[PDB]
Amino acid sequence: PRRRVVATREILPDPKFGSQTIAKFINHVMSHGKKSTAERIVYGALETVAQKRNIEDPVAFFEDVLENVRPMVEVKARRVGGATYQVPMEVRPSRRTALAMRWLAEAAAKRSEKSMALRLAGELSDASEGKGNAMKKRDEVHRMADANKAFSH
Amino acid sequence: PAVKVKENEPVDIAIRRFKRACEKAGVLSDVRKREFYEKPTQVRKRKKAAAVKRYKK
Amino acid sequence: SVSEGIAHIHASFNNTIVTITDRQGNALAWATSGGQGFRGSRKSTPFAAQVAAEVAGKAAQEYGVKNIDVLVKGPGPGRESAVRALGALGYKVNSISDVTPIPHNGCRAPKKRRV
RNA sequence: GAGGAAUACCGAUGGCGAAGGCAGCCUUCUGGCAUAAUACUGACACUGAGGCUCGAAAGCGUGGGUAGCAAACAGGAUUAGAUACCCUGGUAGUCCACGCCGUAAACGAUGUCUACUAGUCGUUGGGUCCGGACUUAGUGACGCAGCUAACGCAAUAAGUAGACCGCCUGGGGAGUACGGCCGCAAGGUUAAAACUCAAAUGAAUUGACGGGGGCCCGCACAAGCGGUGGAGCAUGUUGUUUAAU
């Protein structure tokens, strides 16, 4: 806000994996306050890639793809006497995960797979190697960050 | 304003020493006064305004 | 060919020109902020001078220069960033100097801008 | 290599000059001022209508010069337009010699010359004493009494008095017309009237406002989630239509 720094809320970990990273990603897929509907989408997507790639533990796999999507430099908007300098700055770690979790869900929602659980499974697989809109979005932010690379104010 | 870098001295330290020598010589102060022509009437006001400011403190 | 050289860091408020020559005054290579993809507001930045000196310094590094003394001139912002580029490129500086033309109340300056 | 102009630093509510003004350095011609003492003249003084002299910048005449800057002018932009601000050029002028012009917010918006009236702190040029002290002639910052509508001035008075000169008499019309005088010209100077309106003004007060400043707050922005604006329907209004809607 304008004065204080309100404390962030506590999020309970997901019931099937006990990780706060997946439970936070379920929050990013949920709409209309339907937790369970989003859970089977995430669980179905994770099961599909786990059953296809032959991995016993997919929480570490989701970390690998998440770290491959998280940007490191973002382009902020700054003003110096009426001039707009698109200064590129670092991304605070809480915002890194939020941006990556956001891009994956929004990129998977425009896929062409049959089911959303299948749509999300494709993006998780595609982003694992380093392709897809989620990877493309991260490059676009980094492309703009490298585009200036000249305002260090 | 000439700084001769000595042996075993990182340019980062040397450039800091050069920046100090240039500031002492008033290098950038003179080039800023030559950017535009200051009318003699405006010079007298500016000098006197600084003179009044200097005396007050 | 030549080992001793001179780096000229002529820098203005709009652009910075970094030409590096021999001890005599015969140019070997030159680079500019505006000739590196930067235009307008990004051309008058210290970083655009950092890459201009990097390109020009590396261009004549093949000539054989290792000893070089910079001669900075002008009020531009790339007067400090450009010299750092040469130091980090493997150049062994001889002397940092600031030869800027200061008139002794000579020709009349242009009129003050009303902005 | 050519050429012109200005003289960074020193540089200073520092200095000199009646004002206008006057900054590299050197020579020549030359004015005033400041200072201690002695000698001398012995009121020779102050002011001053007309008059005369000098008088920034711009401008004018003739003749030279012409680097930079730059009216005009040309182009590029910005904009609804942009005969501007900004950008790229650029001529007169700015420079020199000799003459005109005689005007500036030529201001301290404060005529000149006297004497007297608490004090404090700087600073420039002297002087006399013992690093200080004092005394002068300037130049400043404060601050009593006193003055002032108030602001403020306050030994450099806007205080206390005196000498002489100049000027004002509501705001516009108007520093304009006409007539003189001056000027090459631009114009300057002297200087009304009819008519018109009940105001026009100064200082300060309280607000309000500022594309003034400083500090702060609100889902105000920012960071996000979901909408409205497109479809169909419900409802309200406008409009239109109606006998009335």
TrEMBL record, chain A:
GO terms for molecular function: rRNA binding; structural constituent of ribosome; tRNA binding. It holds the Pfam family Ribosomal_S7. GO terms for cellular component: small ribosomal subunit. CDD domains: uS7_Bacteria. InterPro entries: Ribosomal_uS7 (IPR000235), Ribosomal_uS7_bac/org-type (IPR005717), Ribosomal_uS7_CS (IPR020606), Ribosomal_uS7_dom (IPR023798), Ribosomal_uS7_dom_sf (IPR036823). Keywords: Ribonucleoprotein, Ribosomal protein, RNA-binding, rRNA-binding, tRNA-binding. GO terms for biological process: translation. Residues 1-149 form the Small ribosomal subunit protein uS7 domain. It comes from the Bacteria. HAMAP family: Ribosomal_uS7_B. Belongs to the universal ribosomal protein uS7 family. One of the primary rRNA binding proteins, it binds directly to 16S rRNA where it nucleates assembly of the head domain of the 30S subunit. Is located at the subunit interface close to the decoding center, probably blocks exit of the E-site tRNA. Part of the 30S ribosomal subunit. Contacts proteins S9 and S11. This is Small ribosomal subunit protein uS7. It comes from Psychrobacter urativorans.
From TrEMBL, chain B:
One of its GO terms (biological process) is translation. Keywords: Ribonucleoprotein, Ribosomal protein. The keyword Ribonucleoprotein applies. The keyword ATP-binding does not apply. One of its GO terms (cellular component) is ribosome. One of its GO terms (molecular function) is structural constituent of ribosome. Belongs to the bacterial ribosomal protein bS21 family. This is Small ribosomal subunit protein bS21. It comes from Psychrobacter urativorans. The lineage of its organism: Bacteria, Pseudomonadati, Pseudomonadota, Gammaproteobacteria, Moraxellales.
Automatic annotation (TrEMBL), chain C:
GO terms for cellular component: ribonucleoprotein complex; ribosome. Signal peptide: none annotated. Keywords: Ribonucleoprotein, Ribosomal protein, RNA-binding, rRNA-binding. It comes from the Bacteria. The keyword Membrane does not apply. The keyword Isomerase does not apply. Pfam families: Ribosomal_S11. One of its GO terms (molecular function) is rRNA binding. GO terms for biological process: translation. InterPro entries: Ribosomal_uS11, Ribosomal_uS11_bac-type, Ribosomal_uS11_CS, Ribosomal_uS11_sf. Belongs to the universal ribosomal protein uS11 family. Located on the platform of the 30S subunit, it bridges several disparate RNA helices of the 16S rRNA. Forms part of the Shine-Dalgarno cleft in the 70S ribosome. Part of the 30S ribosomal subunit. Interacts with proteins S7 and S18. Binds to IF-3. PANTHER family: 40S RIBOSOMAL PROTEIN S14/30S RIBOSOMAL PROTEIN S11. NCBIfam families: PRK05309.1, uS11_bact. This is Small ribosomal subunit protein uS11. It comes from Psychrobacter urativorans.
